[PDB]
Amino acid sequence: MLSGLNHLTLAVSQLAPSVAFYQQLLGMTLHARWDSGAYLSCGDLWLCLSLDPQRRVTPPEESDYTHYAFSISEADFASFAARLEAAGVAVWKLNRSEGASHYFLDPDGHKLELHVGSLAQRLAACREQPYKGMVFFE
Amino acid sequence: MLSGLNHLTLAVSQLAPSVAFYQQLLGMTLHARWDSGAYLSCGDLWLCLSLDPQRRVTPPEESDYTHYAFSISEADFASFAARLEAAGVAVWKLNRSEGASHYFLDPDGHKLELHVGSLAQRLAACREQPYKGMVFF
Numbered sequence A: 001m002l003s004g005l006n007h008l009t010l011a012v013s014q015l016a017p018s019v020a021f022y023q024q025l026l027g028m029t030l031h032a033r034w035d036s037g038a039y040l041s042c043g044d045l046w047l048c049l050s051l052d053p054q055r056r057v058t059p060p061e062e063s064d065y066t067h068y069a070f071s072i073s074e075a076d077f078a079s080f081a082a083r084l085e086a087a088g089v090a091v092w093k094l095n096r097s098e099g100a101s102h103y104f105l106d107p108d109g110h111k112l113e114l115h116v117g118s119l120a121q122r123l124a125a126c127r128e129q130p131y132k133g134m135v136f137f138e
Numbered sequence B: 001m002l003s004g005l006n007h008l009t010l011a012v013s014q015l016a017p018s019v020a021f022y023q024q025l026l027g028m029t030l031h032a033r034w035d036s037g038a039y040l041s042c043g044d045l046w047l048c049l050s051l052d053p054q055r056r057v058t059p060p061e062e063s064d065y066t067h068y069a070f071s072i073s074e075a076d077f078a079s080f081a082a083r084l085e086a087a088g089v090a091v092w093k094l095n096r097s098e099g100a101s102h103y104f105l106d107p108d109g110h111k112l113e114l115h116v117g118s119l120a121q122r123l124a125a126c127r128e129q130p131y132k133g134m135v136f137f
């Protein structure tokens, strides 16, 4: 039986800018680095950066909607978004759903998000206003 | 301050086969589905499958090493991997370069993994068998 997300691995084209982004800009803890990657943590998340010459710096119009959202409190959201803005980090989408969300790109174009709110919160909102074709499972 | 992964969203080309994969084959919990997506959980993980006309069914030699690993116990690992194999699930990697792992593909070619062990355990294993040039902080 699967018990959760064990780790997220992102392929990166250049290790040093990716470490700078995740450790210094985003505040994740760097536990180890080697010639072709790094291990960080973000709360319970184990993140691996893997240096990969196949990684392309990918514009957001060229990738699909697959994306990775990090948790932040409502109280901290606006100042963290402003930090990303000051750093010139590109936005790939505006928020139109429930709960605060800031949609930003990593140095290789990985699609990231800051989001406030849980799955339970989303399901409660959806129960009140279901999406087209929505059905729930108890 | 960031505190972990809020959710993983995977773009999918065909919603129903993807839901079936994650719910029926991988055993994740399906909470809701709608015309353009589904919400599942795997322990505390919130997984969203999002129907996306832009998603390509992608062979593993065409995509980079980005991948998503799910936790499984030592006792369950081998029989779960063998069941995925017997069900015809495609693979993408054989060499266990990061401990006890099984590397497999979802219907759209998303790179998945079964892994036994935490980050702390991986760091301890690496102190004995480090990756080339490894430094620990």
Ligand SMILES: O=C(N/N=C/c1cccs1)C1CC1
Pocket: A071, A117, A118, A119, A120, B005, B006, B007, B041, B042, B043, B044, B045, B046
């Ligand atoms: O809300 C979350 N997970 N929820 C998991 C669930 C498992 C079973 C029901 S809800 C993540 C913090 C964002």
Ligand SMILES: O=C(N/N=C/c1cccs1)C1CC1
Pocket: A127, A136, A137, A138
């Ligand atoms: O699962 C079912 N219904 N669930 C309804 C729910 C409404 C709101 C949350 S669950 C039916 C037996 C097939």
Ligand SMILES: [Mn+2]
Pocket: A067, A069, A113, A115, B007, B009
């Ligand atoms: Mn999202």
Ligand SMILES: [Mn+2]
Pocket: A007, A009, B067, B069, B098, B101, B113
């Ligand atoms: Mn892995």
